[PDB]
Amino acid sequence: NLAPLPPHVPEHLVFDFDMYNPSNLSAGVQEAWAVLQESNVPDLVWTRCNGGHWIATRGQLIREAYEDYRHFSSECPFIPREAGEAYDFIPTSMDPPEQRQFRALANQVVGMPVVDKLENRIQELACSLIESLRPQGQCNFTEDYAEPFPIRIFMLLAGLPEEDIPHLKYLTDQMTRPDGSMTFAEAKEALYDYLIPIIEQRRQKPGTDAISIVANGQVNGRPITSDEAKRMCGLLLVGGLDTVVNFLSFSMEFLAKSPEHRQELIERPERIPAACEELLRRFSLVADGRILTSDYEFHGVQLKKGDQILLPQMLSGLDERENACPMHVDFSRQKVSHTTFGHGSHLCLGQHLARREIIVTLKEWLTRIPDFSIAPGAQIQHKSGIVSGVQALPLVWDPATTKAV
Ligand code: HEM
Numbered sequence: 001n002l003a004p005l006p007p008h009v010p011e012h013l014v015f016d017f018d019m020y021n022p023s024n025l026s027a028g029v030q031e032a033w034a035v036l037q038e039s040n041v042p043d044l045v046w047t048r049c050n051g052g053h054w055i056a057t058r059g060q061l062i063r064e065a066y067e068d069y070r071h072f073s074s075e076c077p078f079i080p081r082e083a084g085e086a087y088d089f090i091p092t093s094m095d096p097p098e099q100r101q102f103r104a105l106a107n108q109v110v111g112m113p114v115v116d117k118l119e120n121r122i123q124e125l126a127c128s129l130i131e132s133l134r135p136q137g138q139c140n141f142t143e144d145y146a147e148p149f150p151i152r153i154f155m156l157l158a159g160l161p162e163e164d165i166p167h168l169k170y171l172t173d174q175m176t177r178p179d180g181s182m183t184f185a186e187a188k189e190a191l192y193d194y195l196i197p198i199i200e201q202r203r204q205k206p207g208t209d210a211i212s213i214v215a216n217g218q219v220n221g222r223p224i225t226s227d228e229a230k231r232m233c234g235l236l237l238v239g240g241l242d243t244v245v246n247f248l249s250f251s252m253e254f255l256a257k258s259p260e261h262r263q264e265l266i267e268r269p270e271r272i273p274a275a276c277e278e279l280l281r282r283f284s285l286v287a288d289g290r291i292l293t294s295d296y297e298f299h300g301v302q303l304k305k306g307d308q309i310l311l312p313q314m315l316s317g318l319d320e321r322e323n324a325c326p327m328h329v330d331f332s333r334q335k336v337s338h339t340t341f342g343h344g345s346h347l348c349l350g351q352h353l354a355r356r357e358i359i360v361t362l363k364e365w366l367t368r369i370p371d372f373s374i375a376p377g378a379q380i381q382h383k384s385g386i387v388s389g390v391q392a393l394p395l396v397w398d399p400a401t402t403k404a405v
């Protein structure tokens with residue numbers, strides 16, 4: 001439960017927030033985390049939950065810490081410590097200048113050029129999935145669209161069979177929103193047992209898939225090793241299977257409850273990209289951290305070497321000092337400020353793929369199914385963790401109001 005306060009922590013900086021089970025979760029996960037920004041809470045606090053760790057609450061401190069890799073290292077990015085220590089994914093667990101070489105290779109596989117190439121399949125899969133659901137008049141969005149749409153596209157990119165989805169998805173979820181059924185290390189090992197054989201095969205007989213490209217890539221002049229390949233692909237898996245999936249659900253949940261926002265996107269399509277940024281701001285869902293490389297005084301607070309600090313990317317855009325009326329969704333804000341895809345040297349490489357998948361969903365869904373809402377008597381429950389999610393999203397609609405294409 002609560003760990004004993006360390007000697008160097010002033011007790012007035014204590015605020016016991018549990019990132020895996022915040023108190024007001026019933027009101028929404030973003031709302032639950034936003035309590036960290038109430039006037040009674042200092043900008044930098046220490047929680048005794050999950051082993052004890054700091055949490056920066058303002059977009060300003062979050063950006064700073066993310067830029068200063070000298071004091072805030074990526075080596076142990078996950079909390080609790082045990083997870084941050086077992087964490088060895090590349091390029092994430094590396095600090096510059098080492099990260100740089102690996103980031104470039106990962107970029108080759110999920111960067112802009114790959115997205116432009118996959119565009120037609122993304123579009124195709126979206127239209128197909130939506131059209132197949134359209135006449136039914138109901139669906140559980142999380143499992144009927146949010147999961148298959150992003151995941152199948154990734155399985156297509158990586159060259160992995162759809163049959164492995166259930167297994168891989170389970171392991172991934174244990175890493176971001178631990179059930180308690182298994183430790184991060186055990187989750188990490190199982191994913192690795194899966195990847196190792198595949199990597200071996202693709203080193204011997206290269207294909208055009210992302211895995212073959214990584215497994216045979218060159219880093220710093222020499223060839224990548226199997227271990228380095230295994231660790232980079234491990235990261236790609238977690239990113240492809242547990243990010244866009246959850247985000248689509250928060251957005252769709254909001255849309256089902258706000259006819260005014262749906263209509264806006266239907267009558268003025270040129271707004272969709274702007275809407276996408278705003279939804280990414282309001283429904284930001286990631287929260288990881290860094291480890292202190294040495295004693296350091298950050299904004300008047302003395303941090304000691306070894307201290308882990310949670311720097312919630314989710315909070316930057318919900319900060320009122322950053323965005324006026326943060327909880328209000330406004331597709332016409334003059335400036336949408338956020339760090340949803342991160343900040344600093346570890347800025348999300350898969351952000352282009354994410355945005356394309358989001359915009360395609362919005363446009364294609366609103367075209368065929370303009371009017372829809374949350375099923376009567378359904379309680380939507382969110383879940384918190386390194387990456388937040390929606391448990392299930394029961395949606396209902398009148399088929400007679402849909403348009404086939
Ligand atoms: C819903 C969209 C997504 C969000 C919100 C998101 C968020 C993030 C965040 C916050 C980071 C920074 C982590 C840190 O600084 O410790 C990150 C890194 C990364 N993301 Fe994403 N991501 C998304 C989708 C994806 C997708 C689709 C992939 C592709 C498989 C992916 C691959 C990566 C990679 C490779 C990195 C590591 C970059 C590096 O270490 O240099 N992400 N992502």
Ligand SMILES: CC1(C)[C@H]2CC(=O)[C@]1(C)C[C@H]2O
Nearest residue numbers: 092238239243286288386387
């Ligand atoms: C924090 C992240 C969302 C980012 C780095 C990770 O380990 C993830 C859990 C997947 C990837 O997109």
